[PDB]
Structures are given as C-alpha cells and as structure tokens.
Amino acid sequence: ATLNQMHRLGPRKEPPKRLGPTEGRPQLKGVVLRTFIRKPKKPNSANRKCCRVRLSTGKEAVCFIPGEGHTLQEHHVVLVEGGRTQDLPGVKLKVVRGKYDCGHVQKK
Amino acid sequence: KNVLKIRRRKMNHHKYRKLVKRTRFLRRKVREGRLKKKQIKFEKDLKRIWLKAGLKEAPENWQTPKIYLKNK
Amino acid sequence: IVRSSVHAKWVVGKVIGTAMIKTAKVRATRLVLDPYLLKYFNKRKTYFAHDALQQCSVGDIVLLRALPVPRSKHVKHELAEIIFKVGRVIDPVTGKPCAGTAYLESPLSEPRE
Amino acid sequence: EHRELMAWNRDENRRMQELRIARLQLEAQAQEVQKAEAQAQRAQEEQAWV
Amino acid sequence: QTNYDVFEKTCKELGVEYTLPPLHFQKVHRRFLAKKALCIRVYQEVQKLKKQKRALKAAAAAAKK
Amino acid sequence: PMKGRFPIRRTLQYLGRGDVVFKESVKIMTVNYNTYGELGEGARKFVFFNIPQIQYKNPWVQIMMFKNMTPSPFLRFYLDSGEQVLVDVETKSNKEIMEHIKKILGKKEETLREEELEKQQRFHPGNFGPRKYCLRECMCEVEGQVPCPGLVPLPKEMTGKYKAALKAST
RNA sequence: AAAGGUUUGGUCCUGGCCUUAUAAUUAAUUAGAGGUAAAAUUACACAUGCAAACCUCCAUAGACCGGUGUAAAAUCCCUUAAACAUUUACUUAAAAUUUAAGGAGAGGGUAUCAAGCACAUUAAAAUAGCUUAAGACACCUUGCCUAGCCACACCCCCACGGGACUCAGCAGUGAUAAAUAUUAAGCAAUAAACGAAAGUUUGACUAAGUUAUACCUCUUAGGGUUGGUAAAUUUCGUGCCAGCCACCGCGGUCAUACGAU
RNA sequence: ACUAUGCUUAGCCAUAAACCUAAAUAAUUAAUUAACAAAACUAUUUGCCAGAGAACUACUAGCCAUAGCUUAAAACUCAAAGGAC
Ligand code: FES
Ligand SMILES: [K+]
Ligand SMILES: [K+]
Ligand SMILES: [K+]
Ligand SMILES: [K+]
Ligand SMILES: [K+]
Ligand SMILES: [K+]
Ligand SMILES: [K+]
Ligand SMILES: [K+]
Ligand SMILES: [Mg+2]
Ligand SMILES: [Mg+2]
Ligand SMILES: [Mg+2]
Ligand SMILES: [Mg+2]
Ligand SMILES: [Mg+2]
Ligand SMILES: [Mg+2]
Ligand SMILES: [Mg+2]
Ligand SMILES: [Mg+2]
Ligand SMILES: [Mg+2]
Ligand SMILES: [Mg+2]
Ligand SMILES: [Mg+2]
Ligand SMILES: [Mg+2]
Ligand SMILES: [Mg+2]
Ligand SMILES: [Mg+2]
Ligand SMILES: [Mg+2]
Ligand SMILES: [Mg+2]
Ligand SMILES: [Mg+2]
Ligand SMILES: [Mg+2]
Ligand SMILES: [Mg+2]
C-alpha cells in the first residue's frame, strides 16, 4: 500500500477476542446432569469418561473427567476448568479433581 | 495446475441450485412477505418525520409511493 | 477593539461555495503530522465568511479575518482580501496579469491601461 | 528590528526584479531574431504552397 | 481557472453552459428520492404555517394599537 | 525498506533539524511554486525538503501551498498586524530560501534559549514525588537518612506496635 | 525475538497454529517467623453500632474528607469573557478555585449504519440553503487525562413530583460468585471543621488485627517434570484397554510418552 | 426424427477460465537467478489481500432482475490448506 493509503486506513483492524467455554473466567461451578462415554475420533481408540453439567451461568456443557476412575453421579457439584480434550471433539471443558464432590484419583 | 478448488465450488453451486429448486415455492412466499415488511418500515419511517416536525397530518396531496411492489 | 477568541485570527482558503446570501463557504487546509508515518498530510476545515459585497466566486483564494463577535452560529469570519481571483490572477512579483505559468501582459512592457 | 528587516526584504525584491527584467530583455532580443527567421520560412513555404 | 475573460467569451459565443462540479455525490434510488421529497414537503408546510401565524399575530397587535 | 523517496525526511531527527522558528507575528505562509521549469528548481526542493521542517517547529502556522498559478515562485507571509511580507524565491536555492526567511521572520537564538529556561522554572531537584516529576519519591532514599522500613526493618523502639505495648505495661 | 516445533515419499516457497519470556486473578498440592505494600465477585438486598460538629445565643461547618465506576465516545490540549457559595489586600488588586461561550490540532468500534431531514444564511424579512465516503447520521462498547481528573450518590438521565423508599462512609450480614480483612483501638502525629483562645470533634487518618497476592530478611521442603520442541527414567504392570498431550503425537505383548516404582 | 434456441426488429437481463490468469504511466539494463512462467527492477497514483473450510452461503440494501445479479458475514470444524519442483 502507498503512504497515502496507509494514512487513510491507519492500523489494521483487530477482530475481537471471542470468549470460550468458561466465558473468560478461570473456573465455573456446575451440577452434573448425566454421565456418559464419548468415543475419540480416529486414529485413537478408547471409552473416554465425560459428563454433562449445568454451569453457574445457566448453560449446559460437556466436560471431560480426567484420571483413572471417578465416583461422579447426577446432582453432584464440580468445578470445571478450561482446556480442550484433543481427541474428543466439542469437549472444551474439564473437571477439577479434588474440589467439591469430585475427589482426587485413588492412588494404586 | 489442478482444478481442485474449482471442483469444490462446482459442487457447492450444484447442490445449492438443487436446494433452491426444491424450495422455490417456499422462497417465493418468504420474499413477498419480506417486501411487505420492507414497505411498512418505509411508510412508518416517513410518518415519523412529519409527526416529529409537528404536523398532525401528512403534507397535503402526499401519498407514500409503493416502491417495493410489482410496479414494473 | 478586542480581537476574537477563535484561534484562527487569520485563515487562507479556497471559496468552495457561494450559495448563501452575503456569505462565502471557504475551505482552508493545514498540514498535520501523521505520528506513525511522520509525514504531513492536508487537514481541511470549512469557514463561513461574511462577504458584504458578494464579490466572491467559487475557486478563488481569499483571506478571512476573525470577527470580534460571531455574526451567527457559523459565521465568525469576514472577507479580508481576495488573494487570487479565479482565472484573473495578478502576479504579485511583477504585477502583470497572468494565465497560469505565463504572462498575459509582458513585464517588459508598460501598458498603464 | 522588524522594520529594518522588512526594509531589507523590499530591497532584495527590487534587486531580483531588476535581474528579472534584464534576463527577460535578453530573451526578447533572441526570440525576436528566431521569430523573424521562422516567419521567413513560412513566407517561402507559403508561396510555394500557393 | 486560467483566463476567465476568454472563458466568458467562449461560452457566450459557442452557446455552451458550464455547470460547476458538485462538491458531494448524491446517491439516487426510489427509497431516497421518495423520502427526500417528503422531507422537502414537510419543511415547506412547517414554514408556511409559521408565516400565517406571524401575519395573524401581527394583525392582532395592530388592531390593539 | 522505508517507502517513498528520501525516506530520511520521515524521521524525527530530520524534522528537528529545522532552524526557522517564526516570530509570534507570523500566522500564515503561502507557498506559490511551479512544478515545471528551470528557475523554480530551488522552490520545488524547498517544498520537498524544507516545508516539513518548518511546520514541525511552527505547528500553529498555516502553510498552504498553491501550484502553477503564477509565472514565478514566491513566498508570502501573513502577520497578525495585517502586514504581508512577500518574498521572491526564483533562481534561489532551497538553502538560500531558508536562510532568507530565517533572517527576516525568524526568532534569534538568544530568544529561544530564554524561553527554554522559563519552561523548566518549576522543576526543583530537591522536590520529592513520583518519578515522572521528581528524582526521589521519599527521603528514605537519601543517604544517611533513616531507610524505608520495607527494605530495612526499623528498630523496635521506633515502632508503634512496641510503644503501645509499653503504654499498656506502664 | 537471536528464535523454535508442526503440511511432503522428498525438496523449496507461501502460510496459519503452537512453544520458549513476563505479569495478575482463581483453583489443586504444600508452607515456620518477622518487616513492608495491597486487599478486589456483585450500582444485588441490607439486621445492628458508629462515620459532623463547634460555640456566650447570632453565625460558620455538615458542599469537604471518604465511596463507587452509574452514565456517557463520552475527552485531551488551547482561546476568550465573567464572576466566586472564597482568601488576603485596598477603597481599590494579587491569588486560589470555578462557571459560560468557544476551537489550531488530536480523540473507540461497525459502512451489511449511506444518507441525515431543518440539521442554513440574510435581516426590506427574503434566499434555498446546512452536514456527509476527508465517514455525516444511526447503533454498539468503554470511565481517562493518572502528583491526578471526570461522572454518579436508593430508583424514575433530572427530582417540582412520583415510586419498587437508601451502607457505591467504616465494620458487618443475606443472597449471588471461581473470587471470603476487624460488627477492632486512638484523636498522641498530619489533614479538615469550629472557636479570639486555652481547646473540642472526626470509621479522614495514625498505630494495630486478618490473608503466601507481591517485595524484603531468615529458616525448614515442598511442587512439578523426565518421547521431540525442552533440562532430566530404572524396573514392572497394562496391551488401541486403562489412560496421556500446549503442538507433533503415544498405547493391539521388549511402552525412555499410560499407571506404580 | 423433431422442438426451445441460435436469425430480424423493439426492450430487458448484466453474467464468463469477461484470463496476456501481466492495473496504468515514466525510467534503467548494472551498480539482478526461491522454483516455474513472461529476464530483473525503481518511482508515482488508485484498487485489492491478511490460514483453510463453512462461503459464488445467511442476513442487509439497490436493481425492468422473482428458481436472478451485485454487495457479503458469523457461529462451528480443522492444523493445516495452498504454489513450484
Ligand atoms: S518509601 Fe520511603 S519510607 Fe518507605
Ligand atoms: K493411537
Ligand atoms: K512456521
Ligand atoms: K442518576
Ligand atoms: K489528632
Ligand atoms: K513392558
Ligand atoms: K509415566
Ligand atoms: K514417574
Ligand atoms: K486465458
Ligand atoms: Mg461443499
Ligand atoms: Mg486462593
Ligand atoms: Mg476523594
Ligand atoms: Mg457502564
Ligand atoms: Mg448483515
Ligand atoms: Mg439521581
Ligand atoms: Mg445499595
Ligand atoms: Mg448515603
Ligand atoms: Mg460497606
Ligand atoms: Mg481475593
Ligand atoms: Mg481559626
Ligand atoms: Mg500425566
Ligand atoms: Mg510430555
Ligand atoms: Mg426451430
Ligand atoms: Mg464477476
Ligand atoms: Mg475473450
Ligand atoms: Mg455466479
Ligand atoms: Mg447469492
Ligand atoms: Mg441475499
């Protein structure tokens, strides 16, 4: 672009930073609604443990539960955090182990 | 130089043309109603002007033109 | 004989319109530095000026004097002088009529007409 | 000091005006000579053309 | 812009009318031309009413005097 | 590569090299120059190289330039009194034009220095306050004075916590 | 940026994503003591206590301090005039602090907001103008100019009036939130108010209490990681399962990538 | 085999790989090989571009256009897509 064209337009317009599943917040608190299994998109093979939750904002999201074995059930309370599960498409939230009803993984 | 990008657009346009053909009658009714709302919005915007100016009736000998109807 | 408050006590501009009675619309331009590019560009402003004699024509360079009291909402200047008349320029250096970069009357001659 | 500098300016403008008339005078003499010669060619060509 | 005197003679002799370039381009379409016609008409009606009111107001004052 | 010709003209150092600071009387400087010709070469160079420097040092002066309106280039200054100073710059180098206008309508070096000193009259080295305005925020910074309790803990007897305990003990 | 990883069977080009640095808030795990700074979900509803007096009556003060970020593209910088709900001087002038009318220049987003619709001038009252792609108008978002400034003060922009009738003063509570300081002491210092004055008053403030949020001095040791980018794995268990990854990716029997050691 | 149609006369429609896939203009040919194509490169002015797909799409406005054209997004998905050899 010419110097006249750079002057008439100025600095590049910056698209706004749209928020993610946590809505620009470190964590959210949600109530478990259902516990189910999700299948990782190929080339991976597993039965990943997930749960649906109703977040404090009022929306409902799918959250991956990390660790080997959880005791979560419906009506439990959990603290979710950000971070996508790479193989699980659409799962953009995770549960925090050791907060509210969710507990630390039982060591073997 | 392959034509792969042209083939993606080729399929999108083909499928879109068949979608319009299926729902041609529905799309016609959407348009006639979108134009009617477009006309009411035009009339209301003209009524706002003379009422704000303080007139209680539209200017003498004025009839809002119907500009979106099948006049041509 | 206090002077005007406005910063533009003296402004030069081009008469871009003359359709108001006894008033000439004048476009002045100033140089403003682009901070990113550090280059000067033209910022233009519009000034309404009182043309008492309606002696202004579109395209002529004029000098405006700030009025002591604003005549109206926008008329805060008067026509001090017509620096250059449109198509009727008179060379300041020699004093002879010119039509562009040329002399309509040679400076060697002394017509005194 | 302003008045002295504004007087010096007018002197410089007159000094340069004098040079301008001297330069333009020389041009008139030379251009006049060329004009006469060019008119002669037109007279020769114009007579031949007729 | 260069020789106004010749310009005036040329236009008068050749019979050519010269219109100056308009500062701003005006877009035109049925919706704009229809709204712009009402806006001009509404203004005229408002001004006509004011003129009538002034005449009646002045007439009443004159009678009192 | 910086765009344009002579990209050095678009640097703060170049703009600050201008030496013509007009007197307060000067309000407008119209520049009439021709884009084609031989006797106007210095004028064209003056608009190219010098007009930016003049505007940088005289932000409140209106510089308006007109092209190919007259046979010869000239400069006309408009003063606040109403006087008009016409300068003829034909056959003159751009440097010569700058020197001419500096002499007739330029502030002297003595005047400019005096204004600089007056501007800084209210800054005092002894004054304490924020870094933007002062050298030192607190007297704790000075050598020999009691240091800041955050950096160096104060003696116990100089602390309100300790003094309050004694007053209760008394 | 001194860069790095990642398209391919391969190379080069182009190009996005991510990594390495820095800081704040919250959460997991974990922690001794001392000094310092800062304290912060919520313009949501508020239990109780306090936050403005002084003084020979008149007056003055309660218009400040303190709080919040409501509203608004709201402003910055500059010019002019005028007072001042003032101070200190004179019978006439130096300040502090404001208000009103303005404008050299600068000043968030969307142009799929492109026209606005009276937004102009003259001064017989006529003329038909004014703004705008050099971004008007419309809408949306946001405190900024930071020794500080601006707006707000239960709500209805305002507050005659009306209403759903007051902690966005200190401490404290309910609810809500990922978000968690004392229902504390003193007017000794400074500041403000009052008084001619000795003085009185003040949840301003001072000195404390609380809290790894930060810094500082000490003492203890915990936390994470160990395929590549990127510093660092022994053995076993598991066997596309259970699990893991910021990116590339790992796991179907010798897994330096999972779990335990 | 035979229509619409290609033809004429009026009007509409305004789209092409409408592609020399080369904006225009004035210089230079050396103090210059990413690859391929069409040797390199400077200056001036305007237009345009900012990962891929979603998308010659949705909505908006204008239009003799009504299964139309021009104008033209986002959510969401992916870690590539793409060019040359
Ligand atoms: S900053 Fe000076 S005593 Fe702390
Ligand atoms: K795998
Ligand atoms: K890269
Ligand atoms: K309010
Ligand atoms: K005190
Ligand atoms: K093994
Ligand atoms: K491991
Ligand atoms: K390990
Ligand atoms: K072609
Ligand atoms: Mg497709
Ligand atoms: Mg915490
Ligand atoms: Mg305050
Ligand atoms: Mg707000
Ligand atoms: Mg749209
Ligand atoms: Mg209120
Ligand atoms: Mg409240
Ligand atoms: Mg209150
Ligand atoms: Mg409170
Ligand atoms: Mg906190
Ligand atoms: Mg006192
Ligand atoms: Mg792990
Ligand atoms: Mg790893
Ligand atoms: Mg046929
Ligand atoms: Mg096209
Ligand atoms: Mg062709
Ligand atoms: Mg198409
Ligand atoms: Mg379409
Ligand atoms: Mg559409």
JSON list of C-alpha atoms in Angstrom, two decimals, chain F residues 15-135:
[
{"chain": "F", "resi": 15, "resn": "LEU", "atom": "CA", "xyz": [12.24, 17.11, 11.24]},
{"chain": "F", "resi": 16, "resn": "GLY", "atom": "CA", "xyz": [14.06, 18.53, 14.26]},
{"chain": "F", "resi": 17, "resn": "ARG", "atom": "CA", "xyz": [16.96, 19.84, 12.16]},
{"chain": "F", "resi": 18, "resn": "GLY", "atom": "CA", "xyz": [14.80, 22.76, 11.05]},
{"chain": "F", "resi": 19, "resn": "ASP", "atom": "CA", "xyz": [16.17, 26.08, 12.27]},
{"chain": "F", "resi": 20, "resn": "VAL", "atom": "CA", "xyz": [13.44, 28.55, 11.20]},
{"chain": "F", "resi": 21, "resn": "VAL", "atom": "CA", "xyz": [11.26, 29.29, 14.25]},
{"chain": "F", "resi": 22, "resn": "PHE", "atom": "CA", "xyz": [8.95, 32.11, 13.21]},
{"chain": "F", "resi": 23, "resn": "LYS", "atom": "CA", "xyz": [8.16, 35.11, 15.38]},
{"chain": "F", "resi": 24, "resn": "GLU", "atom": "CA", "xyz": [4.77, 35.24, 17.06]},
{"chain": "F", "resi": 25, "resn": "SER", "atom": "CA", "xyz": [3.57, 37.72, 14.42]},
{"chain": "F", "resi": 26, "resn": "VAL", "atom": "CA", "xyz": [3.77, 35.14, 11.62]},
{"chain": "F", "resi": 27, "resn": "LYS", "atom": "CA", "xyz": [0.40, 33.42, 11.16]},
{"chain": "F", "resi": 28, "resn": "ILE", "atom": "CA", "xyz": [0.28, 32.08, 7.57]},
{"chain": "F", "resi": 29, "resn": "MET", "atom": "CA", "xyz": [2.90, 31.19, 4.95]},
{"chain": "F", "resi": 30, "resn": "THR", "atom": "CA", "xyz": [1.52, 30.64, 1.44]},
{"chain": "F", "resi": 31, "resn": "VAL", "atom": "CA", "xyz": [3.91, 28.89, -0.96]},
{"chain": "F", "resi": 32, "resn": "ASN", "atom": "CA", "xyz": [3.41, 29.53, -4.68]},
{"chain": "F", "resi": 33, "resn": "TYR", "atom": "CA", "xyz": [5.63, 27.24, -6.75]},
{"chain": "F", "resi": 34, "resn": "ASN", "atom": "CA", "xyz": [5.69, 25.76, -10.25]},
{"chain": "F", "resi": 35, "resn": "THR", "atom": "CA", "xyz": [6.09, 22.03, -10.87]},
{"chain": "F", "resi": 36, "resn": "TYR", "atom": "CA", "xyz": [7.77, 22.55, -14.27]},
{"chain": "F", "resi": 37, "resn": "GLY", "atom": "CA", "xyz": [10.52, 25.00, -15.19]},
{"chain": "F", "resi": 38, "resn": "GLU", "atom": "CA", "xyz": [14.21, 25.74, -14.61]},
{"chain": "F", "resi": 39, "resn": "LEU", "atom": "CA", "xyz": [14.19, 28.87, -12.44]},
{"chain": "F", "resi": 40, "resn": "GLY", "atom": "CA", "xyz": [11.91, 27.21, -9.87]},
{"chain": "F", "resi": 41, "resn": "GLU", "atom": "CA", "xyz": [14.09, 24.22, -9.02]},
{"chain": "F", "resi": 42, "resn": "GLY", "atom": "CA", "xyz": [15.12, 25.62, -5.64]},
{"chain": "F", "resi": 43, "resn": "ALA", "atom": "CA", "xyz": [11.49, 26.36, -4.82]},
{"chain": "F", "resi": 44, "resn": "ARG", "atom": "CA", "xyz": [10.49, 22.78, -5.62]},
{"chain": "F", "resi": 45, "resn": "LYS", "atom": "CA", "xyz": [13.31, 21.50, -3.42]},
{"chain": "F", "resi": 46, "resn": "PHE", "atom": "CA", "xyz": [12.17, 23.89, -0.69]},
{"chain": "F", "resi": 47, "resn": "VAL", "atom": "CA", "xyz": [8.68, 22.37, -0.70]},
{"chain": "F", "resi": 48, "resn": "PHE", "atom": "CA", "xyz": [10.14, 18.85, -0.83]},
{"chain": "F", "resi": 49, "resn": "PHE", "atom": "CA", "xyz": [12.78, 19.16, 1.91]},
{"chain": "F", "resi": 50, "resn": "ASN", "atom": "CA", "xyz": [12.11, 22.29, 3.98]},
{"chain": "F", "resi": 51, "resn": "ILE", "atom": "CA", "xyz": [8.33, 22.71, 4.36]},
{"chain": "F", "resi": 52, "resn": "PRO", "atom": "CA", "xyz": [8.17, 19.66, 6.68]},
{"chain": "F", "resi": 53, "resn": "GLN", "atom": "CA", "xyz": [10.91, 21.08, 8.90]},
{"chain": "F", "resi": 54, "resn": "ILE", "atom": "CA", "xyz": [9.23, 24.50, 9.09]},
{"chain": "F", "resi": 55, "resn": "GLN", "atom": "CA", "xyz": [5.85, 23.02, 10.01]},
{"chain": "F", "resi": 56, "resn": "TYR", "atom": "CA", "xyz": [7.40, 20.82, 12.70]},
{"chain": "F", "resi": 57, "resn": "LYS", "atom": "CA", "xyz": [8.83, 23.82, 14.58]},
{"chain": "F", "resi": 58, "resn": "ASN", "atom": "CA", "xyz": [5.82, 26.07, 13.87]},
{"chain": "F", "resi": 59, "resn": "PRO", "atom": "CA", "xyz": [2.76, 23.85, 14.40]},
{"chain": "F", "resi": 60, "resn": "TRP", "atom": "CA", "xyz": [0.35, 26.79, 14.75]},
{"chain": "F", "resi": 61, "resn": "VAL", "atom": "CA", "xyz": [1.35, 28.47, 11.45]},
{"chain": "F", "resi": 62, "resn": "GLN", "atom": "CA", "xyz": [-0.89, 27.68, 8.47]},
{"chain": "F", "resi": 63, "resn": "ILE", "atom": "CA", "xyz": [1.23, 26.57, 5.50]},
{"chain": "F", "resi": 64, "resn": "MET", "atom": "CA", "xyz": [-0.92, 26.40, 2.34]},
{"chain": "F", "resi": 65, "resn": "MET", "atom": "CA", "xyz": [0.77, 25.68, -0.99]},
{"chain": "F", "resi": 66, "resn": "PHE", "atom": "CA", "xyz": [-0.53, 26.58, -4.46]},
{"chain": "F", "resi": 67, "resn": "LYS", "atom": "CA", "xyz": [0.84, 25.10, -7.69]},
{"chain": "F", "resi": 68, "resn": "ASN", "atom": "CA", "xyz": [1.33, 26.58, -11.16]},
{"chain": "F", "resi": 69, "resn": "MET", "atom": "CA", "xyz": [-0.77, 29.70, -10.52]},
{"chain": "F", "resi": 70, "resn": "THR", "atom": "CA", "xyz": [1.85, 32.32, -11.45]},
{"chain": "F", "resi": 71, "resn": "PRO", "atom": "CA", "xyz": [4.87, 32.52, -13.78]},
{"chain": "F", "resi": 72, "resn": "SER", "atom": "CA", "xyz": [7.37, 32.66, -10.90]},
{"chain": "F", "resi": 73, "resn": "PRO", "atom": "CA", "xyz": [7.56, 31.15, -7.40]},
{"chain": "F", "resi": 74, "resn": "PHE", "atom": "CA", "xyz": [7.28, 33.33, -4.31]},
{"chain": "F", "resi": 75, "resn": "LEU", "atom": "CA", "xyz": [6.59, 33.16, -0.57]},
{"chain": "F", "resi": 76, "resn": "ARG", "atom": "CA", "xyz": [4.09, 35.44, 1.16]},
{"chain": "F", "resi": 77, "resn": "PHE", "atom": "CA", "xyz": [3.85, 35.65, 4.96]},
{"chain": "F", "resi": 78, "resn": "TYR", "atom": "CA", "xyz": [0.72, 36.99, 6.67]},
{"chain": "F", "resi": 79, "resn": "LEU", "atom": "CA", "xyz": [1.33, 38.66, 10.03]},
{"chain": "F", "resi": 80, "resn": "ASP", "atom": "CA", "xyz": [-1.06, 39.26, 12.91]},
{"chain": "F", "resi": 81, "resn": "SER", "atom": "CA", "xyz": [-0.84, 43.04, 12.49]},
{"chain": "F", "resi": 82, "resn": "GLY", "atom": "CA", "xyz": [-2.17, 42.66, 8.95]},
{"chain": "F", "resi": 83, "resn": "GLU", "atom": "CA", "xyz": [1.17, 43.17, 7.21]},
{"chain": "F", "resi": 84, "resn": "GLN", "atom": "CA", "xyz": [2.07, 40.92, 4.28]},
{"chain": "F", "resi": 85, "resn": "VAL", "atom": "CA", "xyz": [5.73, 40.02, 3.68]},
{"chain": "F", "resi": 86, "resn": "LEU", "atom": "CA", "xyz": [6.30, 38.94, 0.08]},
{"chain": "F", "resi": 87, "resn": "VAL", "atom": "CA", "xyz": [9.48, 37.01, -0.74]},
{"chain": "F", "resi": 88, "resn": "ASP", "atom": "CA", "xyz": [10.65, 36.17, -4.26]},
{"chain": "F", "resi": 89, "resn": "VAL", "atom": "CA", "xyz": [12.49, 32.84, -4.37]},
{"chain": "F", "resi": 90, "resn": "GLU", "atom": "CA", "xyz": [13.15, 32.49, -8.10]},
{"chain": "F", "resi": 91, "resn": "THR", "atom": "CA", "xyz": [16.70, 31.48, -9.04]},
{"chain": "F", "resi": 92, "resn": "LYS", "atom": "CA", "xyz": [17.33, 30.84, -5.32]},
{"chain": "F", "resi": 93, "resn": "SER", "atom": "CA", "xyz": [18.48, 27.56, -3.81]},
{"chain": "F", "resi": 94, "resn": "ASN", "atom": "CA", "xyz": [16.32, 25.86, -1.20]},
{"chain": "F", "resi": 95, "resn": "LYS", "atom": "CA", "xyz": [19.03, 26.52, 1.38]},
{"chain": "F", "resi": 96, "resn": "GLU", "atom": "CA", "xyz": [19.13, 30.19, 0.37]},
{"chain": "F", "resi": 97, "resn": "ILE", "atom": "CA", "xyz": [15.35, 30.42, 0.79]},
{"chain": "F", "resi": 98, "resn": "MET", "atom": "CA", "xyz": [15.56, 29.02, 4.31]},
{"chain": "F", "resi": 99, "resn": "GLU", "atom": "CA", "xyz": [18.32, 31.45, 5.29]},
{"chain": "F", "resi": 100, "resn": "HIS", "atom": "CA", "xyz": [16.40, 34.43, 3.91]},
{"chain": "F", "resi": 101, "resn": "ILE", "atom": "CA", "xyz": [13.19, 33.67, 5.82]},
{"chain": "F", "resi": 102, "resn": "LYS", "atom": "CA", "xyz": [15.17, 32.90, 8.98]},
{"chain": "F", "resi": 103, "resn": "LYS", "atom": "CA", "xyz": [16.73, 36.37, 8.93]},
{"chain": "F", "resi": 104, "resn": "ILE", "atom": "CA", "xyz": [13.60, 38.42, 8.23]},
{"chain": "F", "resi": 105, "resn": "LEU", "atom": "CA", "xyz": [10.99, 36.49, 10.25]},
{"chain": "F", "resi": 106, "resn": "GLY", "atom": "CA", "xyz": [12.96, 34.03, 12.43]},
{"chain": "F", "resi": 107, "resn": "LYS", "atom": "CA", "xyz": [13.46, 34.20, 16.17]},
{"chain": "F", "resi": 108, "resn": "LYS", "atom": "CA", "xyz": [17.03, 34.66, 17.34]},
{"chain": "F", "resi": 109, "resn": "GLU", "atom": "CA", "xyz": [18.96, 32.02, 19.26]},
{"chain": "F", "resi": 110, "resn": "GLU", "atom": "CA", "xyz": [19.01, 34.23, 22.36]},
{"chain": "F", "resi": 111, "resn": "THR", "atom": "CA", "xyz": [15.21, 34.45, 22.49]},
{"chain": "F", "resi": 112, "resn": "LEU", "atom": "CA", "xyz": [14.73, 30.69, 22.09]},
{"chain": "F", "resi": 113, "resn": "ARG", "atom": "CA", "xyz": [17.15, 29.85, 24.91]},
{"chain": "F", "resi": 114, "resn": "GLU", "atom": "CA", "xyz": [15.36, 32.21, 27.30]},
{"chain": "F", "resi": 115, "resn": "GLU", "atom": "CA", "xyz": [12.02, 30.52, 26.63]},
{"chain": "F", "resi": 116, "resn": "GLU", "atom": "CA", "xyz": [13.55, 27.10, 27.30]},
{"chain": "F", "resi": 117, "resn": "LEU", "atom": "CA", "xyz": [14.81, 28.09, 30.75]},
{"chain": "F", "resi": 118, "resn": "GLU", "atom": "CA", "xyz": [11.49, 29.67, 31.73]},
{"chain": "F", "resi": 119, "resn": "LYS", "atom": "CA", "xyz": [9.67, 26.44, 30.90]},
{"chain": "F", "resi": 120, "resn": "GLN", "atom": "CA", "xyz": [11.65, 24.44, 33.49]},
{"chain": "F", "resi": 121, "resn": "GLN", "atom": "CA", "xyz": [11.47, 27.02, 36.30]},
{"chain": "F", "resi": 122, "resn": "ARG", "atom": "CA", "xyz": [9.09, 24.94, 38.45]},
{"chain": "F", "resi": 123, "resn": "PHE", "atom": "CA", "xyz": [11.17, 21.75, 38.43]},
{"chain": "F", "resi": 124, "resn": "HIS", "atom": "CA", "xyz": [13.31, 21.57, 41.56]},
{"chain": "F", "resi": 125, "resn": "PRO", "atom": "CA", "xyz": [15.81, 18.75, 42.24]},
{"chain": "F", "resi": 126, "resn": "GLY", "atom": "CA", "xyz": [15.03, 18.86, 45.97]},
{"chain": "F", "resi": 127, "resn": "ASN", "atom": "CA", "xyz": [11.32, 18.26, 45.36]},
{"chain": "F", "resi": 128, "resn": "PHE", "atom": "CA", "xyz": [10.15, 14.75, 46.28]},
{"chain": "F", "resi": 129, "resn": "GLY", "atom": "CA", "xyz": [7.42, 12.90, 44.42]},
{"chain": "F", "resi": 130, "resn": "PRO", "atom": "CA", "xyz": [6.63, 10.48, 41.59]},
{"chain": "F", "resi": 131, "resn": "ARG", "atom": "CA", "xyz": [9.33, 9.51, 39.11]},
{"chain": "F", "resi": 132, "resn": "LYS", "atom": "CA", "xyz": [7.54, 11.31, 36.28]},
{"chain": "F", "resi": 133, "resn": "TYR", "atom": "CA", "xyz": [8.05, 14.64, 38.06]},
{"chain": "F", "resi": 134, "resn": "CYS", "atom": "CA", "xyz": [10.84, 14.17, 40.62]},
{"chain": "F", "resi": 135, "resn": "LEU", "atom": "CA", "xyz": [14.16, 12.43, 41.14]}
]
